[PDB]
Structure formats: C-alpha cells, structure tokens
Design a protein around this ligand. Sequence first.
Ligand SMILES: CC(C)CCC[C@@H](C)CCC[C@@H](C)CCC[C@@H](C)CCOC[C@@H](CO[C@H]1O[C@H](CO)[C@@H](O)[C@H](O)[C@H]1O[C@H]1O[C@H](CO[C@@H]2O[C@H](CO)[C@H](O)[C@H](OS(=O)(=O)O)[C@H]2O)[C@@H](O)[C@H](O)[C@@H]1O)OCC[C@H](C)CCC[C@H](C)CCC[C@H](C)CCCC(C)C
Ligand SMILES: CC(C)CCC[C@@H](C)CCC[C@@H](C)CCC[C@@H](C)CCOC[C@@H](CO[C@H]1O[C@H](CO)[C@@H](O)[C@H](O)[C@H]1O[C@H]1O[C@H](CO[C@@H]2O[C@H](CO)[C@H](O)[C@H](OS(=O)(=O)O)[C@H]2O)[C@@H](O)[C@H](O)[C@@H]1O)OCC[C@H](C)CCC[C@H](C)CCC[C@H](C)CCCC(C)C
Ligand SMILES: CC(C)CCC[C@@H](C)CCC[C@@H](C)CCC[C@@H](C)CCOC[C@@H](CO[C@H]1O[C@H](CO)[C@@H](O)[C@H](O)[C@H]1O[C@H]1O[C@H](CO[C@@H]2O[C@H](CO)[C@H](O)[C@H](OS(=O)(=O)O)[C@H]2O)[C@@H](O)[C@H](O)[C@@H]1O)OCC[C@H](C)CCC[C@H](C)CCC[C@H](C)CCCC(C)C
Ligand SMILES: CC(C)CCC[C@@H](C)CCC[C@@H](C)CCC[C@@H](C)CCOC[C@@H](COP(=O)([O-])OC[C@H](O)COP(=O)([O-])O)OCC[C@H](C)CCC[C@H](C)CCC[C@H](C)CCCC(C)C
Ligand SMILES: CC(C)CCC[C@@H](C)CCC[C@@H](C)CCC[C@@H](C)CCOC[C@@H](COP(=O)([O-])OC[C@H](O)COP(=O)([O-])O)OCC[C@H](C)CCC[C@H](C)CCC[C@H](C)CCCC(C)C
Ligand SMILES: CC(C)CCC[C@@H](C)CCC[C@@H](C)CCC[C@@H](C)CCOC[C@@H](COP(=O)([O-])OC[C@H](O)COP(=O)([O-])O)OCC[C@H](C)CCC[C@H](C)CCC[C@H](C)CCCC(C)C
Ligand SMILES: CC(C)CCC[C@@H](C)CCC[C@@H](C)CCC[C@@H](C)CCOC[C@@H](COP(=O)(O)O)OCC[C@H](C)CCC[C@H](C)CCC[C@H](C)CCCC(C)C
Ligand SMILES: CC(C)CCC[C@@H](C)CCC[C@@H](C)CCC[C@@H](C)CCOC[C@@H](COP(=O)(O)O)OCC[C@H](C)CCC[C@H](C)CCC[C@H](C)CCCC(C)C
Ligand SMILES: CC(C)CCC[C@@H](C)CCC[C@@H](C)CCC[C@@H](C)CCOC[C@@H](COP(=O)(O)O)OCC[C@H](C)CCC[C@H](C)CCC[C@H](C)CCCC(C)C
Ligand SMILES: *C/C=C(C)/C=C/C=C(C)/C=C/C1=C(C)CCCC1(C)C
Ligand SMILES: *C/C=C(C)/C=C/C=C(C)/C=C/C1=C(C)CCCC1(C)C
Ligand SMILES: *C/C=C(C)/C=C/C=C(C)/C=C/C1=C(C)CCCC1(C)C
Ligand SMILES: [Xe]
Ligand SMILES: [Xe]
Ligand SMILES: [Xe]
Lengths: 227, 227, 227
Amino acid sequence: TGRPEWIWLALGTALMGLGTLYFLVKGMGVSDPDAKKFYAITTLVPAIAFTMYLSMLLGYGLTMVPFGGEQNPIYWARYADWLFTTPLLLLDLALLVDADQGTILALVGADGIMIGTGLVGALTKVYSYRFVWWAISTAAMLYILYVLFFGFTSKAESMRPEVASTFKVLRNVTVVLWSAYPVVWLIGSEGAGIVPLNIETLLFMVLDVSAKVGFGLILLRSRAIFG
Amino acid sequence: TGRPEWIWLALGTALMGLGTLYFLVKGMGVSDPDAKKFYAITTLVPAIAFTMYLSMLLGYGLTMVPFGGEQNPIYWARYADWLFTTPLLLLDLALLVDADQGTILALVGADGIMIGTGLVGALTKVYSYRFVWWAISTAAMLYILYVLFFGFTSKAESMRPEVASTFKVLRNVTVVLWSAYPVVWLIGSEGAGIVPLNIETLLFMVLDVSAKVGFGLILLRSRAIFG
Amino acid sequence: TGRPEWIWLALGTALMGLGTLYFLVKGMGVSDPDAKKFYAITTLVPAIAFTMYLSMLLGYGLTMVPFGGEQNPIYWARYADWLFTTPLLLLDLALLVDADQGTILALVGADGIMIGTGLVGALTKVYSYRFVWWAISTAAMLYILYVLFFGFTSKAESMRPEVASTFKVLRNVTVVLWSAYPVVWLIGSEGAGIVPLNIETLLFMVLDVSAKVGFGLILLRSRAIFG
Ligand SMILES: CC(C)CCC[C@@H](C)CCC[C@@H](C)CCC[C@@H](C)CCOC[C@@H](CO[C@H]1O[C@H](CO)[C@@H](O)[C@H](O)[C@H]1O[C@H]1O[C@H](CO[C@@H]2O[C@H](CO)[C@H](O)[C@H](OS(=O)(=O)O)[C@H]2O)[C@@H](O)[C@H](O)[C@@H]1O)OCC[C@H](C)CCC[C@H](C)CCC[C@H](C)CCCC(C)C
Ligand SMILES: CC(C)CCC[C@@H](C)CCC[C@@H](C)CCC[C@@H](C)CCOC[C@@H](CO[C@H]1O[C@H](CO)[C@@H](O)[C@H](O)[C@H]1O[C@H]1O[C@H](CO[C@@H]2O[C@H](CO)[C@H](O)[C@H](OS(=O)(=O)O)[C@H]2O)[C@@H](O)[C@H](O)[C@@H]1O)OCC[C@H](C)CCC[C@H](C)CCC[C@H](C)CCCC(C)C
Ligand SMILES: CC(C)CCC[C@@H](C)CCC[C@@H](C)CCC[C@@H](C)CCOC[C@@H](CO[C@H]1O[C@H](CO)[C@@H](O)[C@H](O)[C@H]1O[C@H]1O[C@H](CO[C@@H]2O[C@H](CO)[C@H](O)[C@H](OS(=O)(=O)O)[C@H]2O)[C@@H](O)[C@H](O)[C@@H]1O)OCC[C@H](C)CCC[C@H](C)CCC[C@H](C)CCCC(C)C
Ligand SMILES: CC(C)CCC[C@@H](C)CCC[C@@H](C)CCC[C@@H](C)CCOC[C@@H](COP(=O)([O-])OC[C@H](O)COP(=O)([O-])O)OCC[C@H](C)CCC[C@H](C)CCC[C@H](C)CCCC(C)C
Ligand SMILES: CC(C)CCC[C@@H](C)CCC[C@@H](C)CCC[C@@H](C)CCOC[C@@H](COP(=O)([O-])OC[C@H](O)COP(=O)([O-])O)OCC[C@H](C)CCC[C@H](C)CCC[C@H](C)CCCC(C)C
Ligand SMILES: CC(C)CCC[C@@H](C)CCC[C@@H](C)CCC[C@@H](C)CCOC[C@@H](COP(=O)([O-])OC[C@H](O)COP(=O)([O-])O)OCC[C@H](C)CCC[C@H](C)CCC[C@H](C)CCCC(C)C
Ligand SMILES: CC(C)CCC[C@@H](C)CCC[C@@H](C)CCC[C@@H](C)CCOC[C@@H](COP(=O)(O)O)OCC[C@H](C)CCC[C@H](C)CCC[C@H](C)CCCC(C)C
Ligand SMILES: CC(C)CCC[C@@H](C)CCC[C@@H](C)CCC[C@@H](C)CCOC[C@@H](COP(=O)(O)O)OCC[C@H](C)CCC[C@H](C)CCC[C@H](C)CCCC(C)C
Ligand SMILES: CC(C)CCC[C@@H](C)CCC[C@@H](C)CCC[C@@H](C)CCOC[C@@H](COP(=O)(O)O)OCC[C@H](C)CCC[C@H](C)CCC[C@H](C)CCCC(C)C
Ligand SMILES: *C/C=C(C)/C=C/C=C(C)/C=C/C1=C(C)CCCC1(C)C
Ligand SMILES: *C/C=C(C)/C=C/C=C(C)/C=C/C1=C(C)CCCC1(C)C
Ligand SMILES: *C/C=C(C)/C=C/C=C(C)/C=C/C1=C(C)CCCC1(C)C
Ligand SMILES: [Xe]
Ligand SMILES: [Xe]
Ligand SMILES: [Xe]
C-alpha cells in the first residue's frame, strides 16, 4: 500500500526541486545559443520530475489496480513524468552528437511507445497480460539503447574530444540506468511482488535522481555543451 | 458487445506487427538522410497501430458508454492510435511535397481537432450530441483533404516526376480511405447502430491496414523518398 | 453547480467560432510563408478554444470534485484547451521576436508545467493541497511572463519598428491578461469560493476571448507578420 514509502517520495521531490534550482542558477548568464538549448532541455527534466514526485508524495499520483487476486497500489505518475522526461534526455544526447532528424524521430517514437506501453501494463487488470506489455516496452527500450550505444557513439567520433568523451560517459550512464527500470518494474508491485513497494520506490528514486540530476551534472558541467 | 470481433482485432494486430517488422527490415542500411526520415515516420505508424490494436484484442482499449437507451461498447484505443498516427502520415506527405511549416502546423492542428473531437463524440453520453462532434470532426477532415488534394498536388508539381507521381497515388489513397472512416463511424456502434460492432471492426481493420501498411508499401518502395 | 453559467459558455463558444471563421477568411490568399505561420498558429488557437468551450456548454467538460466539505463542479476542459492553446500564443510571440530554440523550449516546458500543474490542482481532493499546485503553477507563469517582458522585448528591439511596436502591444496584453487567470482561479470555485461559478465563467470568458481573438486581431491586422 502507499504510506511507508512516503519518505522516498519526499526525498525525491526535494532532490528534483533542488536539482532544478541548481541548474536554473547555473545557466542564467549563458549566451551561447547551443549551451542554451542544453540548459533548457536539462533544466526541464528535473522540473517535470519534481511535479510528478510531489503528486506521489501528496497521494494524487497513486491509484489502485485490481489484478492477480488483490488490490495493488500503482503510482501512475511515473509514466506522466517519463513520457516527457525520457524523450528530453534523448534529445540532449542527440544534440550533443548532432543526430539526424529521422533518428531523433524514431528515438522519440520508440520512447513514446516504451512509456505508453509500460503505462498500459501497469494499469491492466489481467495479471498475465501486464507482462506482455512489459515485453513490448522492454523491446522498445532495447531499440533505443542500441541506437544510443552504436549509432550515436559513431556520430560522437566526428566531434571534438570534449564532446566525444562527455558523450561516452552520458551514454554509459543512460544505458546502465535505463535498463534497471524494467527489472525493478518486473520484481516490484507492478509485476511480481518480489520486492515491496517500499523498497521499489527507493530504487526508482536513486535511478531517477541519477538519470536526471546526475546525468544533468555530468553534462552541464562539461565544456561539451558549447559550440 | 466486445467478443466476436476479436478475430478482426487479432488479424489487425498481426498485420500491423508484421508491417512494422517488414519496414524495419527494409530501412536498415539506408544512409540517405531524406529516406531515413520517411522510414522513421512510416515505420512508427504501424508500430503505434500495433500497440493499440493489441490493447483492443486484450480488452484494455474497450470501454462502455451509456447513451440512447442501452450500454454501448466503445473501443477508445482507436483515437489514441489515430492521434499520433494520422499526423505522422500527413508529415510523410508534407515531406514528400516539401510543405511550408505553416501549412504543416495547420494540418497537424486540424488533424488533432479531428481525432480529439471524434474521441469526445464517441464518449459523449447525450446520444444527440455525439453527432454534433461528428460534424465538427468531419469538417476538420474535409479541411485536411482539401489542402492535400489541391494545395499539396500543386507543391508536388514542382518536384521531379517520380515524386509527383508517387505523391499522386498516396494522395488518392488517403483521400479515398480517410473519408470512409466518418461514414463507418456514423453507421457503426459509435453512432447509428446500422452496422454491428462485428462488421465495423472489420471495416476499420481493412481501412487501417490499407491506410498504413498499404500507404507505407507504396511510399517506401518508390524512389520518391530519395533526394 | 453547472447550469446558470451556460450563457457565458454559449457566448464563448460563439465568439471563438466566429473568431476562427474570421481569421480563416483573412489568411486565405496569403502567400508570404512568414505570415502563413502566424495565421496558422493564430487561427488554431480560437479553433481549439471553440471545441473545448462547446464541450463545457454541452456538459461534457464538467466534472465533480469532492473537497473541503461538499461536491464542487470543476470544468476540466479549460486545461485541455490551455494546454495547446497557451503554447501556441507563446510561439506567435517567439516567431515575431525570432526567439532562440532553447528559450522557446524552456517557455513551452514552463507553459506545460503551468497548465499541467493547475489541472492537478483543480482535481485534487485535499482542499489544502490545491493551493500548493496553484503556487507551483503561478511560479511557472511568472517565469514565462518574466522572459516575455524582459527577454523578448530585448529581442524585439532588433526588429524593424512595426514588429517592435506590435510586439509591445501583444506583450502588454498577454502579461496583463495571463496574470488575471490565477487570481480568478484562487477566488473562484477551484479555490476559495469567494466568487460564484456563474461570475467566474464570465471572467474566464472575457479573458479567453481577449487573450485569443483580441490578441489575434492585434497581430493579424498589423504588417508585423510579414518578412
Ligand atoms: C509522444 C507523447 C509525449 C505521448 C502522449 C500520449 C497521451 C497524449 C494520449 C492521450 C490519448 C487519448 C486519445 C486516449 C483517451 C482515453 C480515455 C477515454 C480514457 C482512457 O482510460 C484508460 C487509460 C488508463 O485508465 C485506467 O486507470 C485509471 C486509474 O487506475 C482508472 O480510473 C480507469 O478506469 C482505467 O481505465 C481502464 O479500465 C476501465 C474498466 O472497467 C472495466 O470494465 C470491464 C468490462 O468487461 C471489466 O468489468 C473490468 O474488470 S474489473 O477490475 O472490475 O474486475 C473493469 O475494471 C475501462 O472502462 C477503461 O476503458 C480502461 O480499460 O489508459 C491510458 C492509455 C495510454 C495513454 C495509451 C498510449 C498510446 C500509445 C502507446 C502512444 C505512443 C506515442 C507515440 C510514440 C507518438 C509518436 C509521434 C511523436 C510526435 C514522435
Ligand atoms: C496534438 C496531440 C497529439 C493531441 C493530444 C491531446 C491529449 C494530450 C490531452 C490530455 C488533456 C488533459 C488536459 C485533459 C484531462 C481530463 C481528465 C481530468 C479526465 C477527462 O475525462 C474525460 C475524457 C474521457 O473520459 C470519459 O470516458 C471514460 C471511459 O469510457 C470514463 O471512464 C470517464 O468517466 C469519461 O469522462 C466523462 O464523464 C464523467 C461523467 O460522470 C457523469 O456525471 C454527470 C453529472 O451530471 C451525469 O451523471 C453523467 O451521466 S450518466 O451516464 O451516468 O447517466 C455521468 O456519466 C465526467 O465526470 C468526466 O468529467 C467526463 O465528462 O475526455 C477526453 C477529452 C480529449 C482528450 C480532449 C482533446 C481536446 C482538443 C480536441 C485537442 C486538440 C489538439 C490540437 C490540434 C493541438 C494543436 C497544437 C499542435 C502541437 C500543432
Ligand atoms: C506538453 C503537452 C502539450 C502536455 C500534455 C500532458 C498529457 C499528454 C499527459 C497524459 C499522461 C499519462 C502518462 C497519464 C495517465 C494517467 C491515467 C492512468 C489516469 C489519470 O487520472 C488522474 C488525472 C485526473 O483524473 C481525475 O479527475 C477525473 C474527473 O474529475 C476522475 O474521474 C478521476 O478518477 C481523477 O483521478 C484521481 O483520483 C482517483 C481517486 O480515487 C481515490 O482513491 C483514494 C484512495 O486512498 C481515496 O479514496 C480518494 O478519496 S475520496 O474523494 O472518494 O474521498 C478517492 O477519490 C485516483 O484513483 C486516480 O489515480 C487520480 O488520483 O490526472 C491528470 C494528470 C496530468 C495530465 C499530469 C500532467 C503531468 C506534467 C505536469 C506534464 C508537464 C509537460 C511538460 C511541460 C512537457 C515538456 C516537453 C515539451 C515537448 C517541451
Ligand atoms: C523548487 C522549484 C523546482 C519549484 C518551482 C516549480 C517549477 C517546477 C516550475 C518553474 C518553471 C520551470 C519549468 C522553468 C524552467 C526553465 C528552464 C527550462 C530554463 C532554461 O534556460 C533557458 C534560458 C534561455 O535564454 P535567453 O532568454 O534566450 O537569453 C539570451 C541572452 O540575451 C544571450 O543572447 P545572444 O546569444 O544573442 O548573445 O532561459 C531564460 C533566461 C532569462 C533571461 C534569465 C532567467 C533568470 C531566472 C528567471 C532566474 C533564475 C531562477 C531563480 C534563481 C529562482 C527559480 C524560482 C522558480 C519558482 C521558477
Ligand atoms: C512485432 C513488433 C511490431 C513488436 C515490437 C514492439 C514495437 C511496437 C516497439 C519497437 C520500437 C519501435 C517504435 C521502433 C521504431 C523504429 C523505426 C521508427 C526506425 C526507423 O529507422 C530510422 C533509422 C535512423 O538511421 P541512423 O541510425 O541515423 O543511421 C545513419 C547511418 O550511419 C548513415 O549516415 P550518413 O547519412 O551520414 O551516411 O534507425 C536506426 C538505424 C540503426 C543504426 C539500425 C537498427 C537496426 C535494428 C535495431 C534492427 C532491425 C529490427 C529487427 C529485424 C527486429 C525488431 C524487433 C522489435 C522488438 C524492435
Ligand atoms: C465555426 C468553426 C470554428 C467550426 C469548425 C470546426 C473547427 C474547430 C475545425 C476546423 C479545422 C481547423 C482546426 C482548421 C484550421 C486551419 C488554420 C490553422 C489554417 C491557417 O492557414 C494556413 C494556410 C497555409 O497556406 P498554403 O496552403 O501553404 O498556401 C501556399 C500558397 O500557394 C502560396 O505559396 P508561395 O509562398 O510559394 O508563393 O492553410 C491552407 C490555405 C488553403 C490553400 C486555402 C484554404 C481555404 C479554406 C479551406 C477556406 C476557408 C474556410 C471557409 C470560409 C469556411 C470554414 C469551415 C470550417 C468547417 C473549416
Ligand atoms: C527485444 C528483442 C526481443 C529483439 C532484439 C533485436 C535483435 C534480435 C536483432 C539485432 C539486429 C542488428 C544487430 C542488425 C544488424 C546490423 C549489421 C551491420 C551487423 C552488425 O551487428 C553487430 C553488433 C554491432 O556491431 P559491434 O558491436 O561489433 O561494434 O550488434 C550487436 C548485437 C548484439 C549481440 C544483440 C543485442 C543484444 C540484446 C541485449 C539481446 C536481447 C535478447 C535478450 C537475451 C531477451 C530477453 C527476454 C527473456 C525475458 C524472455
Ligand atoms: C465542412 C463543410 C461544412 C465546410 C466546407 C467549406 C466550403 C463551403 C468552402 C470552400 C472554400 C474554398 C474552395 C475557397 C476559395 C479559393 C479560390 C481560389 C477559388 C477556387 O475554388 C475552386 C476549387 C479548387 O480549384 P479546382 O478544382 O478548379 O482546380 O475548390 C473546390 C470546391 C469544392 C466544390 C467544395 C468542396 C466540396 C465538399 C466535399 C462539399 C462539402 C459539403 C457537404 C455536401 C456537406 C455534408 C453534410 C450533411 C451530412 C448535412
Ligand atoms: C514565483 C516566485 C516565488 C519566484 C520569483 C523569482 C525571483 C525571486 C528571482 C528573479 C531573478 C532575476 C531578476 C535574475 C537576475 C538577472 C540580473 C542581470 C539582474 C537584473 O534584474 C533586474 C530586473 C530586470 O531588469 P530592469 O527592469 O531594470 O530592466 O528584474 C526585475 C525583478 C523584479 C523586481 C522581480 C519580479 C517580481 C515578481 C512579480 C514578484 C514575485 C513575488 C510575489 C510578491 C509572491 C506572491 C506569493 C504570495 C501569495 C505568498
Ligand atoms: C527520469 C527517468 C528515466 C531516465 C526513466 C527511464 C525509464 C525507462 C527506461 C523505463 C522502462 C520500462 C520498461 C522497459 C518496461 C516496463 C515498464 C517501464 C516503463 C518501467
Ligand atoms: C491509421 C489510421 C487512419 C488513416 C485514420 C484516419 C481517421 C480519420 C480520417 C477519422 C475521421 C473521423 C471523423 C471525420 C468523424 C467521426 C469520427 C472519426 C474519428 C472516425
Ligand atoms: C486562451 C487562454 C489563455 C491565454 C490562458 C492562460 C492561462 C493561464 C496563464 C493560467 C494560469 C493558472 C495559474 C498560474 C495557477 C492556477 C491555475 C491556472 C491554470 C488558472
Ligand atoms: Xe531524441
Ligand atoms: Xe503535417
Ligand atoms: Xe514558445
């Protein structure tokens, strides 16, 4: 049920908020139109995360879904977050590597299906079908990471060393972090309740902050964002 | 009610999936950044259609709406599909003809209102109002087809013969197919139940596959997508 | 409750519709691709407003929310409207002033959070929390107006006099009008019921038409939209 994890939601709300404030108070006198895009994209990520986490702490983003043989607490707000949030992170990577519009669109579409599909899964009443949606969603994710790791790295090789290396760190961090989400989902309250909603919220919390604030820090503090 | 049409939903899911796989396995070694956009846009259409159709087969995208004087089964998932799907098809046409940003925006907006409006209609409890929404939606569609047929054809005349002719076929196919949707809606379970939900799902199924996979095949197999 | 304000909804529906028709019947023979964008963006605003207002008149966009100690009537359709509508207006201003992509993205994101946040607030069951969302939403708005008034005006100074001055009028009108929305919300049925839903709907109606049709008239009737 939703009550004991309140603390992980509260620390998450706090961390996203401060992460937003810090980024805002760092790109203020930035004139380079390129760095400007990066700060805008990167500042918005934690800001959206902030609002959704707060809706979870306040209980608004929690819903109850009947499946298996009981009433399960499903925090839907995560998808609302990730829906805009994951595409933004991808965009940062695309700008850094100067990706083709076509691949950016394919990536954004793949990302949309990933979250949309995972949302349908977390809300499906037929326990067994939830995992079908999980598989489709995970397939979409693998497609995204495949392009990031192999297609983007290649595009990064044509940029100057600062960009290429900062991209490498960002690439490694997103590939590692993103792939932890589906596993958490599968073993948490949205799938096989192996892990309690308590510990689950703590995992997502560490993953989200790292994937946003951490990712944000690595990027916004490198010279890579400058033309 | 929703059970007998299961087969049309299943074949639709299958056809969209295979259509997605085929397109994916055809634009793999494509380097031309132009063709790349077309494959990305065109591959995403059937992929989204795939997920929504599956939600209908699995019963998730079906809801019940009280109107007239009974409980009517309304597959809402179609709008979720068409919401992203119809705009994408329009974009393919715009890229092919190299449309102005302003007209692309007007077209996307008109398309958004068309599906949004039709969604409101399919879910409205006052039987008589459903048709008001239908009219507004149909008006938006007519605006889109008017621009495609007269405005776009003109823009196509300035491209090389392969583009102009492929555009012509695509234009004719979308104008004919798209206009069948409102009629089906009006005579099906969403409006006047003249046609059973059974036969309706079969019509949309033929229309959707043609309008996506068929449209996709005609486009992706022509040299028109190359610069 | 929702019944007596029906007239403000009906006049609003009428005014948005005629405002859409007028704009459509004014940008018909416009060839300048720049003016074309402005007409497209500006025509879509009242069109969307039209559909949402009609959903409110017809009772579809009204929902009931329990909070405080009673059943309150909340017209949710406003957010659906403003969600696409406010960003479009911002885009008109950005195009006029030729804003950086980064600031356009930050503005669109800030706007999304503003409406998304206000929507969550209008639907939150814990009376006290509604105002938290209100504050966050108002903070997002202030961020937008700050950039419009100080950042954009500066960008406008680099354009020719017709653009700079038309921008000034548009700037003043949006800053004044937009800031009236949060106050209305705070004293209306969504917050402290100081003002009845009757009078509230009349205020939003005057604000919406001015902010869209009025804004639209000032812009589309100046030479500022031409390159
Ligand atoms: C790219 C962009 C950023 C992505 C944004 C997508 C977003 C904008 C789309 C909005 C789309 C719009 C057209 C759809 C509107 C649907 C609306 C009418 C309602 C939908 O409701 C379903 C929702 C989830 O709601 C469910 O959970 C809540 C909370 O827990 C419940 O309150 C609600 O009731 C739930 O609804 C489901 O169950 C109801 C069930 O009642 C059941 O009745 C049956 C009868 O047999 C049984 O009795 C059931 O059993 S039982 O438990 O009691 O035992 C009983 O429960 C149903 O009535 C409801 O109909 C429903 O099934 O779904 C969310 C769907 C998401 C949004 C779909 C996303 C679609 C796709 C993946 C998008 C891909 C994006 C693509 C990548 C874009 C590409 C282009 C780019 C620009 C590049
Ligand atoms: C461009 C882009 C791709 C398009 C994406 C648009 C998408 C992102 C928007 C999300 C928008 C967001 C701000 C709105 C959130 C609304 C939220 C609070 C809930 C909304 O619910 C209404 C939904 C449908 O839900 C309905 O169906 C489900 C399933 O069947 C039901 O479970 C649900 O309850 C239904 O809700 C309606 O009825 C409820 C009724 O209870 C009633 O109470 C009355 C009391 O008098 C009576 O008792 C009724 O009678 S009775 O039957 O029992 O006899 C009883 O039923 C109400 O309480 C609910 O409030 C509701 O009325 O609506 C979907 C709306 C859609 C999304 C609107 C789209 C808006 C517009 C067309 C978009 C244009 C896009 C434009 C083109 C963009 C341009 C810019 C581009 C970038 C270019
Ligand atoms: C940028 C673009 C244009 C913006 C578009 C955003 C849009 C596309 C997003 C769609 C997102 C999707 C992933 C989320 C789907 C959620 C879905 C599953 C259902 C969500 O439901 C919640 C809705 C509102 O619904 C509520 O109102 C209706 C009508 O009045 C109700 O019918 C419905 O039931 C309500 O739901 C709430 O309450 C239910 C409660 O039941 C409760 O149970 C508890 C148990 O303890 C108590 O018993 C309660 O008490 S009591 O009253 O009876 O006494 C009892 O009520 C819950 O079950 C439900 O779960 C729910 O809490 O929420 C709308 C959320 C909005 C859309 C979030 C927006 C997110 C963020 C701000 C977006 C920022 C955008 C950013 C700027 C983009 C940046 C990138 C750009 C490209 C630049
Ligand atoms: C705890 C919180 C998380 C809770 C708050 C709720 C929150 C979720 C909602 C807030 C809205 C939020 C979504 C906003 C995100 C904004 C973020 C994306 C911005 C990124 O930033 C992008 C820049 C774009 O820059 P520019 O204007 O174009 O400048 C051009 C210059 O003139 C050089 O030109 P040249 O190249 O030709 O030489 O934003 C514009 C630059 C401006 C000119 C300068 C702006 C300065 C700021 C207004 C001040 C910084 C903020 C404050 C320290 C406090 C923040 C309070 C909070 C309530 C907003
Ligand atoms: C049955 C199914 C429908 C069910 C699955 C669920 C499904 C709904 C969800 C899946 C996600 C789906 C939304 C993904 C859609 C992707 C689609 C839009 C892609 C269109 O494709 C666009 C390209 C962009 O190309 P590039 O990377 O930029 O290459 C540049 C090159 O180096 C030349 O450069 P130069 O010009 O300078 O010379 O995608 C990138 C090109 C890559 C470099 C190569 C990628 C190869 C693929 C990973 C392999 C093809 C797929 C496999 C046969 C099987 C598919 C499995 C499925 C589970 C994903
Ligand atoms: C009461 C109503 C509110 C209720 C109706 C419901 C409503 C909510 C839904 C309707 C859909 C609505 C969303 C549509 C909005 C459209 C709006 C955004 C359009 C803005 O307009 C943008 C232009 C783009 O122009 P272009 O086609 O690219 O022209 C290029 C030219 O050849 C020069 O080229 P050069 O530069 O190289 O020299 O639209 C294309 C220009 C076309 C070529 C000309 C089009 C003309 C129109 C079809 C006729 C005008 C409309 C009618 C008077 C009546 C309207 C009826 C209503 C039902 C649609
Ligand atoms: C979602 C799933 C179902 C679908 C997966 C798609 C996959 C089957 C097809 C992938 C095809 C592409 C590689 C196309 C060929 C492109 C050609 C130019 C050949 C190059 O391909 C070679 C390498 C990239 O080059 P280098 O690493 O040497 O630098 O691909 C590296 C390829 C590596 C080895 C494969 C990617 C490995 C993923 C992580 C394995 C996914 C399978 C999981 C074990 C399934 C788990 C499900 C369980 C729960 C049932
Ligand atoms: C949605 C409805 C309500 C609104 C429709 C809008 C309509 C009334 C206005 C259209 C205006 C534009 C034509 C503006 C004039 C532009 C000028 C340059 C004149 C050119 O106009 C001439 C031609 C295009 O040129 P060519 O075909 O010769 O190459 O337009 C070809 C015009 C053709 C003849 C009209 C388009 C025909 C549509 C399909 C008919 C819609 C009416 C249906 C019969 C209503 C059904 C409703 C029932 C169920 C109540
Ligand atoms: C949402 C709230 C909580 C957060 C507000 C953010 C704010 C605290 C920080 C603003 C920081 C920026 C000004 C950053 C500094 C940039 C430097 C170059 C210095 C320039 O700053 C000077 C001027 C702009 O220049 P000119 O007017 O002289 O031409 O800013 C003009 C600054 C003016 C004076 C401030 C903007 C005034 C707003 C309207 C006041 C908001 C506070 C309300 C009274 C709170 C109401 C809440 C109640 C209900 C509890
Ligand atoms: C700030 C948030 C980030 C970086 C979120 C990333 C989320 C994912 C990669 C989620 C993936 C999921 C699946 C692959 C399948 C099951 C459900 C999800 C949505 C958890
Ligand atoms: C892949 C799907 C396609 C090409 C769908 C096209 C759909 C339309 C043109 C739908 C139009 C409708 C109306 C004009 C009015 C009534 C309701 C709709 C949504 C069925
Ligand atoms: C056509 C509509 C326009 C220009 C709408 C503008 C709306 C706003 C600026 C709304 C702002 C709000 C807040 C700042 C807080 C509380 C709730 C809102 C959504 C009313
Ligand atoms: Xe992207
Ligand atoms: Xe388009
Ligand atoms: Xe904007």
